[PDB]
RNA sequence: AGGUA
């Protein structure tokens, strides 16, 4: 049987470069993939390798992981905006549109890493079965 | 259908050969001063040649 | 080309090998450097001394040389593909490429024109005409006021 | 290389530069490993009975004179007598091996594989045996993957546990009870899908019965097969990659004569692969010599097909080439021109066929070429549309239709009605005489008499004058 | 007789390209030389584009105006009006997906800017100079990055059956498949409300504007990579007889002949499991031919035999 | 050179060709601008569709003039249909949409 | 002929040597050439010799065969009016004015790489072959360009 | 989008709408920009006009990727289509069509 | 190709 999956949770160095792309003008995505990669240990590496026996199947599985981490990141940012509005933050009109006040703002990177870690724990739970 | 009706009426039938004679282009006139006939070797000559 | 080459480098020679030598290249560099220093003088590309007239004979000879080059390729292929011993050489020379290319030059070319034949003066002018266009000359993408 | 290049020719040369040329004995060594691979796959087919049964069926068909002898076998490693003797002893070995199924069996299998070692068969029959064994692999893996899908998606268990427990017999109820023995929840869940799994196991056993061998031996033999064609394909690809330079050198001679060089080398590579599939060193010749003719044939085929804008048959292309060569010969001999009479004399071909062939040998020209040697107008700007009816003729047709309709209106009811469907006047359909008669409930000479009466009535110089103008 | 208030221009989908097509052009054949009846199923085909002469099947079966609402089922050829041959389009099923040159070498490269990826990289990937990762896995390899031959080999050796990377237009199309527009739009909208950095906000604004515009266009980015190539009606690329050995033929006809030849050769090579070098070469063939057909002149010109002149292209 | 009927073209329907009777006179973009400068609309439409490229409209006009009637079918010039088909020949969708 | 001949074989010691050329008399005169629509041309016949040396050793002729007056094409012959008849139409070859082969030391002016100080460049224009360019940059450096690369 | 190069007529009708309405969003402020005649003709509302007399390939690509939908109402657009121009004699016709559009 | 405005 297969019940071994240790998540490499919580690190200050989980926010140190995730924005790295091999190429110019970094944008969203390719930080999501790094986010859910660094959230899993090499034990999870080997577990994913052994559990799924097909390259297209693992490919689709990684796409599903990307999709779910993106969805949870989106919902976490939505709830953060909601609680900021409930905490007294308003919408500041900049030349990009609405934002929140700096004292009420954090950053998207830590939200993404938290979402990736929670999804990593979810995948571990699905893999310890 | 109208052409078929007319050929049935007049008793005429389609010609086996179509006219392709060289006409003088409209707008020009004049006298035929010279006629050249070139028939390749191995092909029967005609009277004019 | 050789006589102009020696003329612009101020040599008493007016003849020599067509292919360049290292000395000629070095002389060209020295002359260009002297002009850069202001000692030399530039030469117009519009002076009739720098523009040469290829009459009918020279153009025909150049095109015939091109035909000889392609038939040379054919001959060199044949000399190894064909017999390396006695075989009659008329069977290995091809008249089609040379004649076809010569006919292409004389018949269908930028500088082979129907003689404008409505006056004796027209014929004389056409035969005396000098064209800056054609193969190896100037395209109409010009003006380019200098040459005009 | 990475040199801001946009020419496939350049980096094709880069690709061919990586592989180093071979020597004469290098080709022999590569063909030797190819022969080892093909002998391995032949032994794998040998251990498979059904392909041999199919081969014997075709041998029997040939003996019945229903198939060509040269479409089954080509040469042997020491003719109808040799083929008959080898197939007779081969049938004997096959039956003596099959009897051991339905120590000794291993010896019979070894002797069987040995007696196939003499056979050298046509590539088509060998490819058929390979495809049959491949579809055996496909069906075996399909049954295994069906069991996979059922046990995994219906019982919610990981793919890792299945491999250890199921493998070893794979066609019995032992693993069912073995997995149940641990009282696992998925073992209990398997009891609701056990019927489908058992039915699939029954189909697997039926497949084994069809093969006549246990499924484990099927896997062993097919894995030996797979490694066999893997080695063979690797060696063949090595040969093809190492011999690209010959293709490039041969094609560059044909490039000066029109057609893209890249297409020529691609076709030459196709011919090179064909030669590699057909190459042998038992002949004793050099591989380059054999591949040269194949590449030349491929290049000639490419020039015949993909270089002519209009299709010209290969034999017609060869006739054109012969005509051109003889024309050049006569031109350089007589020194004046190729006269059609001598061209007719040299060929068996009359001369009118010669001139029509000469017309065919020329390729179509673009309209984008300027008419008059670089006038800013193109050739296609002058081509008249001959498929368009002139408005003069369209107006004439309209007036004729109006006149015919008026004239038919000038006749009686039934006569005009018969005429309308007889010739298809003013409807988009035409009807035969008997078809009109059936609707007029009169199927006799009467309908044609009515038509003739209408014609005779139209003969009068009161209804024909209006139609007289149209036909002069 | 036709009423329409506006004209829409958009990305043609392979399905609607097949919708335009009446038949698949499978052969580069044109005519029977001596008999000028078009071949089947060549660039000129009555079975696909309609009959040559007015209202008669090109088999000698039906010659009348009566047989016009029913097509000839006794042979491939159909029977309609000849003007239909001026409007029916065809389609060619490309064995390998091919990139559209217009979306590539325009000064703003729509493929380049949609992938936010510089032009040299697309040129090298498409022309088979280097590999690109079409999604990775748990590797140290980014979702998108170009790799050379030895780098790709080292990645493959270091990382096993987790590494999805291809080369050329197939890889580009896979990348466009793996990219989702609406989800990225939502992500950018969330990030903009949270981010306060000037440069980050500018990047987010530019990308959100681009993606929202693309979504409003209602186009799928994968459509930029041509899977099926439409072919123009034959009448718009006419082949008309002319006296002597000369005949007027369209440069489009020769270009499509080259495209069909290279596509069929690619199909044959794939069926024969040809070595990777040869199949890459033939995909290069197909890409170059398609680029010349769409726009000959941005790829180092294409000339034909027996005629030294840049071939006319659709652009 | 003067024509009212004669040589049309294959790829387009612009009337031109023939050393016996030539085509019409090129009503280029300059003349289209000249008509647009006035309130010249119907004359421009005649220049564009009826007499230039609309084969159906051209035939209908000839029949109407012979019959003694002066009106036109706007139709669509065959050149524009050629343009649509040729744009569709690329990987580009172009369509005609109603309101 | 003397430029292209003798033609040396790529291995085989079978060389083709030129002797002379002879112009055949035209089969048709100017008048009948114009009437018949055929070119007014003279056949070109050339004397050539194939020489096979010692096989195989250092050079030196062993055997030689001579082809006399081999026909390698027909060249249009010039009329007394200074014209040529090619397809029954009397054509003229216009003399061409073109830059002479040699060296031109031209001045580059009007475009200065955003620096001013108009420059100089020397172009070696061959009668046949590849151009050579020696040009300057506003940094007082000299550069070589074979053709225009 | 606070930096969008937009046609002034649409901007003017939008600002008129927001001013007459109680909704004063956002906004909205604009600054007129000057473009060369080639650029102005190149960046028109209709891709047919831009593609006709200027860089055709790039304009067509931009329109296709943007999914533009030109609604005519321009002399050259209707010239290409082959209907009456919306100028002079034809202006009466198009004005009629304007009444037939967006209303029964 | 050349010539015309």
Sequence-ordered alpha helix ranges (H) in D256-335: 261-278, 287-306, 314-334
Q: Enumerate the β-bridge partners of residue D333.
A: none
| Nearest CA among E306, E299, H45, E307 for reference residue E315 | E299
Is residue D342 a contact partner of residue D329, using CB atoms and an 8 Å limit?
no
Region of G12 (left: φ > 0; alpha: ψ -120 to 50; beta: rest) is: left
Angle at alpha carbon of residue E103, lines to E100 and E107, rounded to 5°:
140
Measured in degrees and rounded to the nearest 5, phi and psi for residue E274 equal -65, 160
Helix (H) or strand (E) holding D283: none
How big is chain D by its Cα radius of gyration, in Å?
38
Long-range CB pairs of E37-41 (<8 Å, 24+ gap) are E38/E234, E39/D311, E40/E76, E41/E76
Cis before D28? omega within 30:
no
Smallest CA–CA distance from F32 into chain H, residue:
H79
Q: Where are the beta strands (DSSP E) in chain F?
A: 92-97
Dist. CA G22–CA G67, nearest whole Å: 13
Yes or no, beta carbons of D336 and G45 under 8 Å apart: no
Instruction: Give the ranges where D75-214 is alpha helix by DSSP (H).
Output: 80-99, 104-117, 123-155, 159-166, 174-180, 185-189, 194-211
- Tell me whether residues E87 and F11 touch, CB distance under 8 A: no
Any known ligand binding at E185?
A: no
Distance in angstroms: CA F28, C1' I2? 24
Within 13 Å and on the Cβ side, how many CA atoms surround A82? Answer: 6
Instruction: Confirm if G69 and G45 have CB atoms less than 8 A apart.
Output: yes
DSSP for C66-133 reads HHHHHHHHHHHHHHHHS-SS---GGGS--HHHHHHHHHHHHHSBTTEEE---S-HHHHHHHHH-EES-
**Which residue among D331, D332, D336 places its CB closest to the CB of G27?**
D336
User: Would the CB atoms of F86 and E232 count as touching at under 8 Å?
Assistant: yes
Residues 77-136 of C with CB under 7 A from strand I: 110, 113-114, 116, 131, 133
CA distance E80 to E71: 7
CB F76 within 8 A of CB H82: yes
Write out the two tokens for E50: 């309609």
Report how far residue E231's alpha carbon sits from residue E88's, in angstroms, rounded to the nearest whole number: 9
Going by C-alpha positions, the residue among H98, H75, H79 that lies closest to residue H87 is H75
Residue C138 contacts residue C132 (beta carbons within 8 Å): yes
Residues 6+ apart with CB under 8 A from D458: B9, D407, D411, D464
The two three-digit tokens of residue H18, written as one number = 């927001």
Question: Which residues in chain D have Cβ-Cβ distances shorter than 8 Å to C96?
Answer: 328, 331
List chain A residues with CB under 8 Å of H3. Answer: 95
D22 and D242 in contact (C-beta within 8 Å)?
Answer: yes
Could you tell me which of E291, E305, E272, E282 has the C-alpha nearest to residue E100? E291
User: Could you identify the residue written with the tokens 């050539």?
Assistant: G48
- Protein H36 CA to nucleic acid I5 C1', in Å? 33
What residues of A are in contact with residue E117 (Cβ under 8 Å)? 23
Q: Which nucleotides of I are covered by protein (CB under 7 A)?
A: 1-2
Q: Provide DSSP, E238-287.
A: --B--STT--EE-HHHHHHHHHHHHHHHHHHHHHTT--HHHHHHHHHHHH
Report helix, strand or coil for D111: helix
Which of A49, A91, A102 minimises the CB distance to E162? Answer: A49
How far, in Å, CA of A95 to CA of F5, rounded? Answer: 64
Mutate one of E9, E107, E176, E189 to test the H interface: name it (highest H CB count within 10 A): E9
User: Do D388 and F5 make contact, defined as CB atoms within 8 angstroms?
Assistant: no
Q: Would strands E21-24 and E89-99 be described as parallel, antiparallel, or unpaired?
A: parallel
Q: In angstroms, rounded to a whole number, what is the distance separating the alpha carbons of residues A84 and H80?
A: 56
The alpha carbon dihedral of A73, A79, A85, A89 has a sign of negative
Contact in structure between A129 and A46 (CB atoms under 8 Å) = no
Inter-chain CB proximity B6 and D470 less than 8 Å: yes
Q: How far is CA A117 from the centre of its chain?
A: 7
Helices (H), A27-54: 32-38, 42-51
Residue A65's closest CA among A110, A33, A40? A33
Q: State which H helix or E strand residue D54 sits in.
A: helix D49-63
Chains adjacent to B (≥3 CB pairs closer than 8 angstroms)? D, F, G
* Separation CA D129–CA D123 (nearest Å): 10
| Residue E287 near residue E98 (C-beta atoms within 8 A) | yes
Give the pair of three-digit tokens for residue D234.
Answer: 């690797």
Instruction: State how far the Cα of D1 lies from the Cα of E145, in Å rounded to an integer.
Output: 19
- Smallest CA–CA distance, residue A86 to chain D, in Å, is 44
Residue C101 half-sphere exposure, CB side, CA atoms within 13 Å?
18
C107 and C100 Cβ atoms separated by less than 8 Å: no
Contact F36 H83 (CB under 8 A): no
Measured CA to CA, the distance from residue G140 to residue E281 in angstroms comes to 45
Hey, is the C-beta of E176 within 8 angstroms of any chain F C-beta? no
SS3 state at D252: helix
Closest CA to F45 of D181, D123, H86: H86
Q: What are phi and psi of F58, to 5 degrees?
A: -65, -45
H82 vs F contacts (CB less than 8 Å): 45, 48-49, 53-54, 74-77, 80
Whether the Cβ atoms of residue C61 and residue C91 lie closer than 8 Å to each other: no
| Chain E: residue whose CA lies nearest to A76 | E190
Asked if strand I comes closer than 7 Å to C139 Cβ, the answer is no
> What's the distance, CA D84 to chain centroid?
33
CA dist list (Å): C78 to E199, G15, G68: 70, 12, 20
CB–CB of E39/E31 below 8 Å? Answer: yes
User: What 8-state DSSP symbol labels residue F47?
Assistant: I
Residues sharing a CB contact under 8 Å with residue C58, sequence separation 6 or more, in sequence order: none
Residues 6+ apart with CB under 8 A from D198: none
Q: Where do runs of H (alpha helix) occur along D335-390? A: 340-346, 352-361
Two structure tokens written together for D183: 């009282």
CA atoms within 13 A on the CB side of D98: 16
- In angstroms, what separates the C-alpha of D145 from chain A's closest C-alpha? 12
Residue E229 sits at φ, ψ, to 5 deg, of -105, 115
The CA distance from G20 to G2, in Å, is 10
Read off the tokens for H103: 């209303």
In sequence order, the 6+-apart residues with CB closer than 8 A to the CB of F72 are F42, F45, F46, F49, F50, F57, F60, F61
Q: How far is A72 from chain E (nearest CA, A)?
A: 11
Which SS3 state, helix, strand or coil, does residue H87 take?
coil
- Contact call for residues H60 and F92 (beta carbons, < 8 A): yes
- The gap from C-alpha H90 to its chain's centroid, in whole angstroms, comes to 19
User: Is residue C20 helix, strand or coil?
Assistant: coil
Angle between helices D123-155 and D159-166 (to 10 degrees): 120
Q: How far is D381 from chain B (nearest CA, A)?
A: 21
- CA–CA distance, D194 with D180 (Å, rounded to integer): 12
Q: How many residues does the structure list for chain D?
A: 472
Q: What angle do CA G5, G10, G13 make, to 5 degrees?
A: 75
Alpha carbon of G26 to those of C60, C107, D41, F36: distances in Å?
18, 18, 73, 64
Asked if the bond preceding D373 is cis, omega within 30° of 0, the reply is no
**G28, HSE (Cβ side, Cα atoms, 13 Å):** 19
Length F85 CA → I1 C1' (Å): 35
Spatial distance between the Cα atoms of A58 and A52, rounded to a whole number of angstroms: 6
Distance of CA A110 to the CA centre of its chain: 9
Sheet holding E21-24, edge to edge: E21-24, E89-99, E225-231
Q: Which residues, 6 or more positions from H84, have their beta carbon under 8 angstroms from its beta carbon? A: F41, F42, F44, F45, F74, H78, H90, H93, H94
Using CB atoms within 10 Å of the CB of residue G102, give its burial: 0 to 12 exposed, 13 to 18 middle, 19+ buried. Answer: buried
Q: Which of residues 6-45 of H touch E (CB under 8 A)?
A: none
Gap between the Cα atoms of D311 and D321, Å rounded: 16
E45 appears as a binding residue in the annotation: no
Q: Residue D419 in contact with residue D454, Cβ under 8 Å?
A: yes
The torsion angles phi and psi of F21, rounded to 5 degrees, stand at -125, 120
Q: Is B39 exposed, middle or buried (0-12, 13-18, 19+ CB in 10 A)?
A: exposed
User: Distance between the two ends of chain E, CA-based, in angstroms?
Assistant: 30
Q: What is the DSSP string of chain E?
A: ----SEEEEEEPPHHHHHHHEEEE------EETTEEEEPTTSSS-HHHH--SSTTB-TTSS-BSSSTTSS---SSS-----GGGGGT-EEEEEEEEEEE-SHHHHSSS-HHHHHTT--HHHHHHHHTTSSEEES---SSSS-SS-EE-HHHHHHHHHHS-TT--EE-SHHHHHHHHHH--HHHHHHHHHHHHHH---HHHHHHHHHHHHHHHHHHHHT--GGGGEEEEEEE--GGGS--B--STT--EE-HHHHHHHHHHHHHHHHHHHHHTT--HHHHHHHHHHHHHHHHHHHHTTSSS---BTTB-SPPP---
> C-alpha angle D186/D191/D197, rounded to 5°?
100
In this structure, are residues E181 and E214 in contact, taking their beta carbons and an 8 Å threshold?
yes
Nearest nucleic acid nucleotide to C109, CA to C1' distance? I1
For helices D80-99 and D104-117, what crossing angle results, to 10°? Answer: 160
* Element (DSSP H or E) covering residue D459: none
Q: Give the chain E residue whose CA is nearest to the CA of D356.
A: E34
Taking contacts as CB-CB distances below 8 angstroms, the residues of chain D near A129 are: 158
Residue E289 · residue E265 · CB < 8 Å:
no
**Taking CA atoms, what residue in D is nearest to C104?**
D373
Backbone angles phi, psi at D52, to 5 degrees: -70, -35
Q: What share of chain F is helix, strand, coil (3-state, %, to 5)?
A: 45, 5, 45
- What is the spatial distance between Cα A44 and Cα A42, in angstroms, rounded to a whole number? 5
Q: Which residues of H touch E224 (CB under 8 A)?
A: 65
Q: Which of residues 176-195 of D touch strand I (CB under 7 A)?
A: none
Nearest-angstrom CA–CA distance, G96 and D289? 52
CA C108/CA C114 separation, integer angstroms: 10
Strand-strand pairing, G95-99 and C130-131: parallel
* Pick from F73, F89, F96: CB nearest E314: F89
Write out the two tokens for E8. Answer: 């829409």
Q: Find tokens 């019940």 and name the residue.
A: A3
D 310-339 near B (Cβ less than 8 A): 339
Separation between Cα atoms, residue F22 and residue F7, nearest integer Å:
7
Q: Point out the residue nearest to I3 (C-alpha to C1').
A: C116
DSSP state of D71: G
**Tokens encoding E258:** 């080259």
> What are the phi and psi torsion angles at H24 (to 5°)?
-95, 30
Q: Are A80 and E194 in contact (CB under 8 A)?
A: yes
Chain D interface includes E244 (CB < 8 A): yes
E72 is in an annotated binding site: yes
| Positions 8-37 in C, CB within 7 angstroms of strand I | none
């Amino acid at each position: 049987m297969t019940k071994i999956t240790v998540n490499y949770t919580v690190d200050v160095k989980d926010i140190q470069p995730k924005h790295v792309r091999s190429e110019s003008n970094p944008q969203n995505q390719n930080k999501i993939r790094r986010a859910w990669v660094l959230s899993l240990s090499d034990n999870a590496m080997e577990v994913i390798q052994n559990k799924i026996k097909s390259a297209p199947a693992r490919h689709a599985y990684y796409e599903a992981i990307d999709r779910e981490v993106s969805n949870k990141w989106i919902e976490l940012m939505r709830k953060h905006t909601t609680e900021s509005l409930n905490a007294g933050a308003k919408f500041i009109m900049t030349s990009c549109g609405e934002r929140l006040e700096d004292d009420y703002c954090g950053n998207a990177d830590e939200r993404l890493i938290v979402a990736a870690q929670i999804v990593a724990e979810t995948i571990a739970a699905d893999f310890n079965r | 259908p109208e052409e078929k009706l007319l050929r049935a009426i007049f008793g005429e039938k389609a010609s086996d050969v179509k006219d392709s004679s060289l006409r003088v282009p409209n707008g020009v006139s004049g006298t035929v001063i010279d006629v050249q006939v070139f028939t390749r070797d191995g092909v029967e000559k005609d009277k004019r040649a | 080309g050789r006589m102009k080459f020696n003329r612009s480098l101020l040599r008493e020679e007016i003849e020599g090998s067509g292919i360049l030598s290292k000395d000629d290249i070095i002389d060209v560099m020295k002359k260009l450097i002297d002009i850069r220093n202001g000692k030399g003088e530039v030469d117009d590309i519009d002076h009739l001394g720098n523009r040469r007239i290829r009459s009918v004979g020279e153009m025909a000879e150049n095109q015939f040389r091109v035909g000889l080059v392609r038939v040379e390729r054919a001959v060199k292929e044949r000399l190894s593909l064909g017999d390396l011993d006695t075989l009659m050489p008329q069977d290995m020379i091809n008249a089609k490429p040379i004649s076809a290319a010569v006919k292409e030059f004389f018949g269908s070319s930028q500088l082979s024109q129907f003689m404008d034949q409505n006056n004796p003066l027209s014929e004389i002018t056409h035969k005396r005409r000098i064209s800056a266009l054609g193969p190896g000359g100037l395209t109409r993408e010009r003006a380019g006021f200098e040459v005009r | 290389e990475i040199g801001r290049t946009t020419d496939p020719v350049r980096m094709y040369m880069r690709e061919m530069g990586t592989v180093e040329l071979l020597t004469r004995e290098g080709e022999i060594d590569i063909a030797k490993r190819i022969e080892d691979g093909i002998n391995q796959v032949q032994c794998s087919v040998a251990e498979y009975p059904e392909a041999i049964t199919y081969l014997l069926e075709q041998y029997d068909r040939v003996e019945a004179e229903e198939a060509r002898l040269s479409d089954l076998i080509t040469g042997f490693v020491d003719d109808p007598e040799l083929a008959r003797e080898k197939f007779a002893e081969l049938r004997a070995q096959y039956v003596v091996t099959r009897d051991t199924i339905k120590a000794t069996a291993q010896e019979e299998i070894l002797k069987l594989s040995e007696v196939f070692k003499q056979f050298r068969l046509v590539p088509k029959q060998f490819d058929y045996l390979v495809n049959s064994m491949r579809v055996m692999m496909d069906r075996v893996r399909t049954q295994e993957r069906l069991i996979m899908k059922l046990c995994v998606e219906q019982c919610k268990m990981p793919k890792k546990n299945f491999i250890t427990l199921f493998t070893g017999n794979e066609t019995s109820d032992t693993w069912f009870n073995a997995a149940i023995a641990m009282n696992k929840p998925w073992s209990e869940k398997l009891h609701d899908v056990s019927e489908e799994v058992h039915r699939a196991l029954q189909k697997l056993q039926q497949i084994e019965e069809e093969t006549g061998l246990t499924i484990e031996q099927v896997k062993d033999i097919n894995r030996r097969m797979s490694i066999g064609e893997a080695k063979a394909r690797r060696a063949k690809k090595e040969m093809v990659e190492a011999n690209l330079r010959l293709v490039i050198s041969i094609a560059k001679k044909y490039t000066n004569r029109g057609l893209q060089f890249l297409d020529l080398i691609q076709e030459g590579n196709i011919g090179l692969m064909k030669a590699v599939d057909k190459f042998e060193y038992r002949r004793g010749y050099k591989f380059s010599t054999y591949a040269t003719w194949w590449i030349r044939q491929a290049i000639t085929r490419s020039i015949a097909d993909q270089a002519r804008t209009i299709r010209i048959p290969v034999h017609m292309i060869e006739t054109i080439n012969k005509l051109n060569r003889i024309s050049r010969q006569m031109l350089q001999e007589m020194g004046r021109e190729p006269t059609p009479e001598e061209l007719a004399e040299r060929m068996l071909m009359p001369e009118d066929k010669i001139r029509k062939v000469l017309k065919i040998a020329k390729e179509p020209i673009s309209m984008e070429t300027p008419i008059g040697d670089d006038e800013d107008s193109h050739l296609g700007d002058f081509i008249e549309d001959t498929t368009l009816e002139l408005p003069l003729d369209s107006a004439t047709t309209e007036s004729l239709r109006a006149a015919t309709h008026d004239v038919l209106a000038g006749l009686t009811a039934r006569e005009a009605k018969v005429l309308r469907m007889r010739f298809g006047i003013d409807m988009n359909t035409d009807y035969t005489l008997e078809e009109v008669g059936k609707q007029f409930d009169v199927t006799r000479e009467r309908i044609r008499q009515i038509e003739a009466k209408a014609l005779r009535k139209l003969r009068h110089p009161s209804r024909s004058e209006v139609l007289r103008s149209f036909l002069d | 007789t036709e009423e329409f208030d506006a004209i829409k221009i958009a990305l043609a989908s392979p399905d609607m390209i097949r919708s335009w097509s009446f038949g698949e052009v499978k052969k580069p054949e044109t005519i029977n030389y001596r008999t000028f009846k078009p071949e089947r199923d060549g660039l000129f085909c009555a079975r696909i584009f309609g009959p040559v002469k007015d209202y008669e099947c090109l088999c000698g079966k039906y010659k009348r105006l009566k047989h016009r609402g029913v097509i000839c089922e006794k042979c491939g050829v159909e029977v309609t009006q000849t003007k239909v041959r001026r409007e029916r389009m065809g389609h060619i099923e490309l064995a390998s997906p091919t990139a559209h040159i217009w979306f590539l070498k325009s000064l703003p490269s729509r493929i380049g800017l949609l992938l936010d990826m510089p032009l040299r990289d697309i040129e090298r990937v498409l022309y088979f100079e280097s590999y690109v990762v079409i999604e990775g896995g748990m590797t140290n390899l980014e979702r998108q990055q170009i790799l050379t031959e030895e780098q790709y080999l080292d990645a493959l050796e270091e990382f096993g059956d987790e590494f999805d990377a291809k080369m050329g237009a197939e890889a580009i199309q896979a990348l466009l498949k793996s990219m989702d527009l609406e989800q990225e739009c939502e992500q950018l909208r969330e990030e903009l409300n949270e981010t306060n950095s000037e440069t980050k906000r500018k990047k987010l604004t530019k990308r959100i504007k681009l993606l929202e515009a693309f979504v409003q266009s209602g186009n799928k980015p994968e459509w930029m990579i041509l899977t099926v190539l439409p072919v123009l009606p034959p009448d718009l690329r006419p082949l008309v007889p002319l006296d002597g050995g000369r005949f007027a033929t369209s440069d489009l006809n020769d270009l499509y002949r080259r495209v069909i030849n290279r596509n069929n050769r690619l199909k044959r090579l794939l069926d024969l499991a040809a070595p990777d070098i040869i199949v890459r070469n033939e995909k290069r063939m197909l890409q170059e031919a398609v680029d010349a057909l769409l726009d000959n002149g941005r790829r180092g010109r294409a000339i034909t035999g027996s005629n030294k002149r840049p071939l006319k292209s659709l652009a | 050179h003067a024509r009212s009927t004669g040589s049309y073209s294959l790829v387009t329907q612009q009337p031109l060709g023939g050393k016996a009777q030539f085509g019409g006179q090129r009503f280029g973009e300059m003349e289209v601008w000249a008509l647009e400068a006035y309130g010249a609309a119907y004359t421009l439409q005649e220049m564009l569709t009826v007499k230039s490229d609309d084969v159906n409209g051209r035939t209908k006009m000839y029949k109407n003039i012979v019959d003694g009637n002066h009106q036109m079918e706007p139709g669509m010039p065959e050149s524009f249909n050629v343009l649509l088909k040729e744009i569709r020949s690329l990987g580009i969708n172009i369509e005609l949409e109603d309101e | 002929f003397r430029s292209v001949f003798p033609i040396q074989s790529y291995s085989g010691n079978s060389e083709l040597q030129y002797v002379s050329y002879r112009l055949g008399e035209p089969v048709f005169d100017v008048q009948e050439c114009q009437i018949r629509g055929v070119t007014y041309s003279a056949p070109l016949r050339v004397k050539l010799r194939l020489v096979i040396y010692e096989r195989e050793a250092p050079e030196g002729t062993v055997k030689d065969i001579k082809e006399q007056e081999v026909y390698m094409g027909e060249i249009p012959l010039m009329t007394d009016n200074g014209t040529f008849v090619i397809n029954g139409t009397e054509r003229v070859i216009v003399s061409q004015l073109h830059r002479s082969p040699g060296v031109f030391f031209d001045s580059d002016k009007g475009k200065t790489h955003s620096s001013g100080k108009v420059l100089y460049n020397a172009r070696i224009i061959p009668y046949r072959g590849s151009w050579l360019d020696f040009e300057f940059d506003p940094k007082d450096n000299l550069f070589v360009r074979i053709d225009r690369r | 989008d606070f930096l969008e190069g937009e046609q002034v007529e649409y901007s003017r009708v939008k600002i008129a709408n927001r001013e007459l309405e109680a909704n004063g969003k956002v906004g909205a402020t604009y600054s007129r920009d000057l473009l060369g005649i080639t650029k102005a003709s190149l960046a028109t509302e209709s891709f047919i006009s831009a593609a006709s007399f200027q860089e055709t390939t790039r304009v067509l690509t931009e329109a296709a990727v943007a999914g533009k939908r030109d609604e005519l109402r321009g002399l050259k657009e209707n010239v290409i289509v082959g209907r009456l121009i919306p100028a002079g004699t034809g202006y009466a016709y198009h004005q009629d069509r304007m009444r037939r559009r967006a209303a029964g």
